[PDB]
Each structure stands twice: as C-alpha cells, then as structure tokens.
Design a protein around this ligand. Structure first.
Ligand SMILES: [Zn+2]
Ligand SMILES: [Zn+2]
Length: 219
C-alpha cells in the first residue's frame, strides 16, 4: 500500500502537500506541491497524483475554513495535473500554461479551464507569480514564486541529485534554462522541488550542475 497524503506547514500561509504513486521504473514516488493561503482563500500549486488525494487535500483546507480559489499545474505530467478533472467537476478554476494545456490536449487528457501565455504571469497579483525558465524536465515546465515569503516552487524542473525521468526532457536546453532560473531566484529563502526535500537557493546551483552533467553524459 502507498503512503497517505501528507500536509505540512512550511511557512506562514504556505503548506507542502505530499502524495505518492507507484511509477514504472521508478518505484513509489513522492510528489510535493504547495497550498498557498491568501487571507481566507487557498490556491493549489500542483494537484496530487490522483482525484482521491486532490479531494482529500481540498476537504482538509475547506474544513479548516479556506475557500479553494484555484489551482495551477507546473507542467503536463499527471503528478502535477492528476486532480484537474476532479477540480473542474467541482467548479474550482484550474490554470496551466498554454503549452501545458496543448500537451494535455494532445495526450487526450483533461485540460485546465484557464490558460496563460508568456514568460511571466500573476496567478494572484503580488502574491503568486508564475515564471517560465525554458525547456528542461519538460518543454512546458514553469515555476511558481511567492514574493512575500521568498519561496520558489521549482516543480519537477528542480533536480539537485539526478535528473529523473528524461522521457519528455530537453537535455540540450536544460542548462540554459537552469542558469536563467538561478539568476532570477538566487535570493530564494526556500526552494521546493517536486521529488526531493525542500532546500535553500543552493538547489538552483545543484540543478544547474546536474543539467550540465546530464548533457555532457549524452555525448
Ligand atoms: Zn514530470
Ligand atoms: Zn514529477
């Protein structure tokens, strides 16, 4: 049996949710996302793997008095988008980049109800920012920045000890994207990866080194 959904406070108004799925050739895979509170409204940063855990996550915050105002998915893989169909069924606004939605549509999967195009986007002005560093883990991966807390959710782009699943990866572009990401968020207090533990800004450097190492290996 897979471990249960975990919800843990990371900072004021910021929670980490961890869900688990068995993924072929990878084993049981932990997935971190965030829940961000702005007054009495909650925003999901990535959904858990499944509708089940997405519902558990939503009920947990609603039963504590937070309205779910929306979700954003950092890329098209199911560990970021698995709960979009369920959220859509509950009339909770779902967001993804235009390219993420395109890839979902291409894969015959449910798409977010809202989309954004361009390098920067405010999900919530001055509270929750989305940034596209360029292709890496996937062509569409984006990160989410919380300027009030100096917290960066790096998603599956942040890979400080190894690059993970390269099936949809762009190894040529990843070092360039990681360099850009590092320049932009060097002052992050915390960096939250999808598949390894929260760290500080050094995770940006480590990701860059792993990206460079990964590209070098392929030649
Ligand atoms: Zn992924
Ligand atoms: Zn992932």
């Amino acid at each position: 049996s897979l471990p249960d959904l975990k919800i843990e406070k990371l900072d004021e108004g910021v929670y980490v949710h961890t869900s688990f799925e068995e993924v072929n050739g990878w084993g049981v895979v932990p997935k971190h996302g965030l829940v961000v509170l702005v007054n009495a409204e909650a925003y999901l940063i990535d959904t858990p793997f499944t509708a089940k855990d997405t519902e558990k996550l939503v009920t947990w915050f609603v039963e504590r008095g937070y309205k779910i105002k929306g979700s954003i998915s950092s890329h098209f893989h199911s560990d970021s988008t698995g709960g979009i169909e369920w959220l859509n069924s509950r009339s909770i606004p779902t967001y993804a980049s235009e390219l993420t939605n395109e890839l979902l549509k291409k894969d015959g999967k449910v798409q977010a109800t809202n989309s954004f195009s361009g390098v920067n986007y405010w999900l919530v002005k001055n509270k929750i920012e989305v940034f596209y560093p360029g292709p890496g883990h996937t062509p569409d991966n984006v990160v989410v920045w919380l300027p009030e807390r100096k917290i960066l959710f790096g998603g599956c782009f942040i890979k400080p000890y190894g690059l993970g699943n390269l099936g949809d990866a762009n190894i040529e572009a990843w070092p360039k994207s990681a360099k850009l990401l590092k320049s932009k968020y060097g002052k992050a207090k915390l960096v939250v990866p999808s598949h390894s533990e929260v760290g500080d800004a050094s995770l940006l450097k480590l990701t860059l080194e792993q990206a460079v190492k990964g590209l070098n290996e392929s030649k």
